[PDB]
Amino acid sequence: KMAKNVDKPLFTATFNVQASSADYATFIAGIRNKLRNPAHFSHNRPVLPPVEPNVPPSRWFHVVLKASPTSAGLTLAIRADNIYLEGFKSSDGTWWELTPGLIPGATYVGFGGTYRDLLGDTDKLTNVALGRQQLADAVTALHGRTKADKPSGPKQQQAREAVTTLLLMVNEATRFQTVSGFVAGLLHPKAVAAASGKIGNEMKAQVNGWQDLSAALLKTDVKPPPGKSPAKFAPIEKMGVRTAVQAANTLGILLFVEVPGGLTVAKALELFHASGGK
Ligand SMILES: Nc1ncnc2[nH]cnc12
């Protein structure tokens, strides 16, 4: 304790909830691009820099979701090292937080940021509806939160539903091309009927095994010992991911993992800084 720089993002990505599917894809791609360690890719997918050892989380960026081109943002506070959502900012200026005492002068929303906290189990993910209206409503309900009012059970219930929706349509979208592609597939022009959708089991598993999938691809990059054949990608069948090429098409941006024979935390951060990363 406590978190550092929440007020000073390394960049801000902005999205208009009424904008085109292509603009959403551009929005997501830009986040991954700005998060990347320039010195570390795996199969031409970006890898996040390691989490800095011996300090509290000090690298953040903001995402702004807007009702319209001129509306003011619902601001999300997200870690630039593991893309964790920890805070959001309502219209009256109140930073709300998902971890007690994490963010400077923030107010604990009343519930945790984990899928078990928000839903009740990691396997309820395949029940959450996403889409343009779900996104807009989630943005509204959060941005409409005021520093005064009674955390009614009903109000909390709606709020957990909202965070679950945005985590999926922003955070998990940044992490996974499957998720981002799914969300982009839900976004249509006005001339198309409104649409909703829930992620399938492969994406649920992917979302629940980001570290595992990241680590699994990272192992294929390790150069092998003498006399042993080089490493083969090891399938995560529940994820529908059986090959390295499939893993690369699935990963939006990889979490940094220390794998045996791969980059260490110190070394990857060293390469990150040498390439101009901040
Ligand atoms: N609170 C949270 N923030 C970011 N990613 C998450 N994945 C699951 N829960 C999350």
From Swiss-Prot:
GO-annotated cellular components: cytoplasm
Additional facts recorded: Three similar RIP 30 isoforms I, II, and III have been described in Barley.
Residues the record marks as active site: 172
Source species taxonomy: Eukaryota, Viridiplantae, Streptophyta, Embryophyta, Tracheophyta
Enzyme Commission numbers on file: 3.2.2.22
GO biological process: defense response to fungus; killing of cells of another organism; negative regulation of translation
Pfam entry (one): RIP
Major localisation: cytoplasm
Function of the protein: Inhibits the elongation phase of protein synthesis. It inactivates fungal ribosomes even more effectively than mammalian ribosomes and is thought to function as a constitutive antifungal agent in plants.
Highest taxon of source: Eukaryota
Keyword Ubl conjugation: no
Keywords: Acetylation, Antimicrobial, Cytoplasm, Fungicide, Hydrolase, Plant defense, Protein synthesis inhibitor, Toxin
Organism of origin: Hordeum vulgare (Barley)
Gene Ontology molecular-function annotations: rRNA N-glycosylase activity; toxin activity
Subcellular location: Cytoplasm
Protein's recorded name: Protein synthesis inhibitor I
Known catalytic reactions: Endohydrolysis of the N-glycosidic bond at one specific adenosine on the 28S rRNA
Family in the record: Belongs to the ribosome-inactivating protein family. Type 1 RIP subfamily.
